[PDB]
Amino acid sequence: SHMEQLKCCSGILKEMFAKKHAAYAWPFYKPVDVEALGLHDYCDIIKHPMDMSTIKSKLEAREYRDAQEFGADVRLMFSNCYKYNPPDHEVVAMARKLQDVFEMRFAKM
Numbered sequence: 001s002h003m004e005q006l007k008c009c010s011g012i013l014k015e016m017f018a019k020k021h022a023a024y025a026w027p028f029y030k031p032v033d034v035e036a037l038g039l040h041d042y043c044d045i046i047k048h049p050m051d052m053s054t055i056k057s058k059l060e061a062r063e064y065r066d067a068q069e070f071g072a073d074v075r076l077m078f079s080n081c082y083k084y085n086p087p088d089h090e091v092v093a094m095a096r097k098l099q100d101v102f103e104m105r106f107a108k109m
């Protein structure tokens with residue numbers, strides 16, 4: 001059942017948004033604000049920006065064919081972060097902590 005699969009995907013995303021993970025998850029809640037952050041090269045380096053709010057909208061709208069399409073967007077959000085930033089960046093360590101939460105829940109769904 002794909003209704004079942006996406007209920008699980010919604011629960012995973014809702015947990016990623018929960019207070020327990022907020023110390024490291026907050027930079028991923030919304031699209032990267034390139035203008036406010038002065039990252040004028042970001043839209044040239046990152047061809048497909050992704051964030052948790054965009055993913056939530058797609059889940060609500062039922063735009064993912066399966067859990068695999070949901071997973072690929074979550075992993076695109078993390079890969080954009082690892083691609084754009086130096087490996088020692090504070091945001092990369094935050095992306096890794098959030099990805100630890102996602103990979104465990106997603107594998108056990």
Ligand SMILES: Cc1[nH]c(-c2cc(NS(C)(=O)=O)ccc2Oc2ccccc2)c2c1C(=O)CCC2
Nearest residue numbers: 027028029030031032033080081084085090091
């Ligand atoms: C280069 C970069 N900076 C930000 C960032 C986004 C916001 N708020 S926002 C969502 O844009 O509304 C605020 C501050 C930010 O910088 C940080 C965040 C934490 C630690 C150090 C710098 C992100 C980012 C990414 O690569 C992806 C994830 C978010």
